[model samples]
Target chain A: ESADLRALAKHLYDSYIKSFPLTKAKARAILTGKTTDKSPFVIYDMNSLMMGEEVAIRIFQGCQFRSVEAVQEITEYAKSIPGFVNLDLNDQVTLLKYGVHEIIYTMLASLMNKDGVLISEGQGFMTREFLKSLRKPFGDFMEPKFEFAVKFNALELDDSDLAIFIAVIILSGDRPGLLNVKPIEDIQDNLLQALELQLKLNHPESSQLFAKLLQKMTDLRQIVTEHVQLLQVIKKTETDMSLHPLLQEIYK
Target chain B: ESADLRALAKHLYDSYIKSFPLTKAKARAILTGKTDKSPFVIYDMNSLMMEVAIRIFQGCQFRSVEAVQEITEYAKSIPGFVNLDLNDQVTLLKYGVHEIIYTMLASLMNKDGVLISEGQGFMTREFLKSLRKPFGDFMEPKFEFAVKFNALELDDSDLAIFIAVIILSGDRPGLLNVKPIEDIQDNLLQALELQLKLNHPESSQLFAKLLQKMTDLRQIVTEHVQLLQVIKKTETHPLLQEIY
Candidate 1:
């Protein structure tokens, strides 16, 4: 039974990866390419950052538009994780309630380098310096994420590794208020076993590669918590903020 | 000195059992009326119940919801606690509140029965068993954990950081930020670990054993959520509706 989940875990991840959105696929492509127009990863820095609520709301609104796409994309990947579809709808909702932000952060690793994240798919990069400059108004937004992505990039994970890792994040039994803990625990363990398999297959180096990735899940979790805090700040401060019903619910 | 954590840990007591209007008072009235009436065996069977299981469940909800507000102020007071995020605050408290309520509930519990309103009001396990299913069933397991919780016998100091760990938990599913929460959780756990050493000098494995119960407590919480699900179809104080 464990072996069944282990192999299927990686296989399903493969299926999910090959069928991503054109924009996401484009974002991944920007990581290694020569886009004629030679599309300069349109970078944004401190110049527009200091307007406080002005720039903060603009970024917040634009982010809301882009967020809906990622939310749907996460579920597509979630459903592919073998036993995930078999989970009770309530448990599944709880899983997404917690794991979606983590998965988004993981996929976001694609759109970022050491210093900044690429937005509008591949067209624009928001320099880390600019976001840090987002200071008092949206204080929760910037500080935590920049460090997380920089470290995740330093580790250099492959698609196969992420496929299982994403499953692990959503499938956790340790999450508060799960309906059926045993099955999720079993599935989470089996996938982690599979994740361990992929790690060795991908990086045969002497380093503690698996240990490094496990902590990153912890790191991803930290980012998601702080992300929720930022949303709390944004909702109150950005009074004009209008969110999609789905995104609004995902947040508050 | 572990003083900063100890400082917050000591401050934690004011928020605890100082005011739980329902658990103690209701338990008191249930015990006091029966003995004062000098009620006989047949009357003891049902009359002592005071109210049905649903009423008991609501009373518990009222206490927990009230407990919710109490936890927020204490949590905000943790060193750099607010620096984390408002969302983390709610999510951490959302998940953590149940454990804290139950942890202190252990205070009223003993080996066979628990003390409620006063020493004269010790209610036997069978008294709760005589009540009914669902609520009675829910009440029983906590005693099992509480009696076992008595094994480690944590004072307020050890419990203080443990309480912090509950609030600072990074593992909750709804959290948007985990890094600083983990940092806070780490700080709290270590201070707690040291307290275990400082307090319990005789037992070597007691540290690991207490941590074991932290996981064990959640098993009871999982049961509480399911029991409530069966229940609410059968009630909400707004917070109960939103949480369950």
Candidate 2:
């Protein structure tokens, strides 16, 4: 139990310092190759962090991360993590078509501990020659189990924050559309496949996150279904003939 | 000359009516084959109308049209001609992406004229409809002029707005991913090509909007761009690596 708690805290700190935010602004930066030497930073407001921490605690307090509500709460919290303010100019992208948002969401959630504090474990000392107070090594004095005791403990996610939570996971903006010398339109085409790989490995919280992730993709599939309705609407309104013509053959 | 003015006005009016103001209420009825329509219908304040009319009269000061500004001013005074409102969902797609704003800018500077104030013109009936309620047939009148006026007033080769304006003709939501279907990307894309074709015969505006659409896209083509540089700046960067 203590080891799992410690692992969670360490992972949270490592991920936060390394996890990326998602926003239209960030999307633009990543696509443009403006960020080569940038350190990840948490730019969310204190209140937002508190809201997320409260959510994280509720999600991790269970016997195991089992309840659907807990999963959803964490998903929402995860999706909100990648605010564009934390990213650099090199990271913005012009197109965040679909799945890129999902990767960013997952990385953010994994970076926060159940106790909502970093576990502070690792090696490598960060320094600044210009700033004397800035040199610091990256490891904890002790594991995060004791530090996590002060946090509120709970189980199960609130029922209402469901759709948005999963939507963030499916639209993980950090990874999907990260083109490698190539830009593609269908950003989420491979997201579900990658998610499936993580599930098969039973990688820590992967099992829980994978279930929530799968459901979110299913939900997205449902939403795109409505776009099909738009195609039909455009057809019927064609009486004026010479006026605004439907040009998008997005379906065809 | 009077015949040409009246003919142009009617053509513009007819085209406008047939195209847009693709309100949700309009869509619901059209798709379902039902006309149970309901929408916001409030007349402009009387003071506002007077202000508009004064501006219009001033805009068309001489019976002989002058510069493009006067044309745009008169057009702006038209019953329901709305300037680009960023918050307006329709404007984001229509004027923003398609150069509807730019076309309006061009028309304002180069070609618009006041043809019917007392409803005495070649297109007398439609001109009267415009005077009685500008916005009532606002959709149709504007669409028609958009089609006829751009062709008549501006140089077809240089009129970037023609292609862009036509794209907004269709009732689509936030325009994007259009590079794939450049032909279908703009409503007047074909019409613009047709106008160009009448002279150049094979000209297309496909490259017109792209060259000027966003300075950033052009930069991408020229600079050795790296997306990671932009990613590093984000608070929560894109999940590109994960889904790649």
Candidate 3:
């Protein structure tokens, strides 16, 4: 009886990961040899540094805007879940604050294949070396994120599992300032129970997948901690940079 | 009136720091000359770890209703705390006390380890791990994080504002009036920013890093709570069970 519900959740996850298309499988085949042609990855002079900064800032802005849009979508999706919107408005906001970053990273996990993330929709990939070549703190800000991405990707979660994992992150009761913790906890437990059932049927050989997924949540927290620190640094260093108010409030 | 209120907060912090001395100044002085005696004595590795665990637990043990009363009294002594709703007061104490205790633990910490008692001595990382068997390896992670957290080098005034930000946090679950709590948090954050600028003068990153430490502290506490939940399932000490 419960197995059907678990299968439905797994089905939902599979569809979500399919639509996201992070790997750019075909794009990679076409762009393989000429990937370095992307500007700002290599700078020969002061003019190039200026161009590099602009590109770095552009990437940062792109990630910021896209993250907001993705978060809105995720929030809307969360609202559709049974009993989610019934919770207190404040609890809803608190959960988003705590959960959004984790969700965003989970979505972006595909773009991060190795030591770098795919930028400009797989037309350009920024390796760790190229990111370090950009500007002073921009490199420093991005390095840890890529490192985290590599480790997260190594877990090799399929779309179905990643989808369920994200729901668990969103429904967590431990998010500071939740009002109705019991209901939230109930929802999370239901999801976990479903996940256990799904994993049993799907990956009988891997006994520790559930535990590993929980540890990944902890790793996500650590990564976001570093991400927040970097954002705070950018806020301090470049006073002229206009941060989206949503980003400001989340980090604040 | 605002300055007067700020003065009261500043004064309250002074009293708070006075009661909770973060540094082992006396212990540092005594332990400097003699390298012979290990800082704390563990009579038997088995029973001694349990004893040390209890002693460590005693420092942060405010679990009972009376303990809640004790926390309430201390918090009420702070200026803005009395103005909060009674439920909010209790809620803040419930969620915030553990963070505050860990903050104190971080503050009292040095690179080596934490000072267990002022004049008695500091406990090292190795000694803490030796207490590992029955307790389920809880204290070591805190000690490890504390050493890194203390590396930020915040002073008492800065730490006061930081602690205020922590204790008065509006984000804790079940808060009734978030606006008032957030207002208090904003003021505390401003004070911390100002304090960092005045005290450090050289580094711009210090303020941001210090704020980031709050998130790190939260993560550490999350792990601690998980550890405690596991410990609760096992046969346990009466005091540990009572407090938890």
Clashes per candidate, residues 3 or more apart or on different chains? 16, 100, 2
Local distance difference test, each candidate: 0.66, 0.30, 0.64
Per-residue lDDT tens digits of candidate 2, residues A102-213? 3323222332333232211111111111112211210121122212222211112221122223323433332322433121212222333232333343344422333333
Write the residue-wise lDDT of candidate 1 on A1-252 in tens digits.
556645675586676675455333456566556555535344455453432216666776777777788888888878888788898889999888877887888877767766677766465667776666664656457656766777677777767677777787788665656888778867775676677667777788724456446646656755675677667776686677786898767765
* Candidates 1 and 2 compared by TM-score, better number: 1
Q: Compute the lDDT for candidate 3.
A: 0.64
Residue B236 displacement in candidate 2 (angstroms):
38
Instruction: Point out the higher-scoring one by lDDT: 1 or 3.
Output: 1
Ranking by DockQ: 3, 1, 2
The lDDT of model 2 is 0.30
DockQ of 2: 0.01
Model 1 ranges with Cα > 4 A deviation: A1-6, A22-38, A45-53, B1-244
Instruction: Give per-residue CA lDDT, model 1, range B174-214, as digits (tens).
Output: 88988888777666665665667777887543444455466
- The TM-scores that each candidate's chain B achieves against the reference are 0.77, 0.25, 0.77
Which regions in candidate 3 have their CA more than 4 angstroms from the true location?
Answer: A7-11, A14-53, A121-123, B1-218, B221-244
Candidate 3, B1-244: lDDT as tens digits: 3464457457756765555543333333444435345466433455245445655554545422333454455576665777999899889988877777777666555555555554354555565666647463766777766765666666566666676667787657788898787666656655665567667887543554555456557788777877767755554456655554
Listed in order, the DockQ scores are 0.04, 0.01, 0.04
- Model 2 over residues B1-244: C-alpha lDDT tens digits? 3343334334443444333223223332332223433322213444233344334323333321232223333333222233333233243232333234334422322122212222121122233235433322322333333433333324423243333333333223454433322322232333333444354534332222122222222222122123323434532315533422
TM-score of chain B of 2: 0.25
Clashing pairs in 3: A177-B172, A177-B173
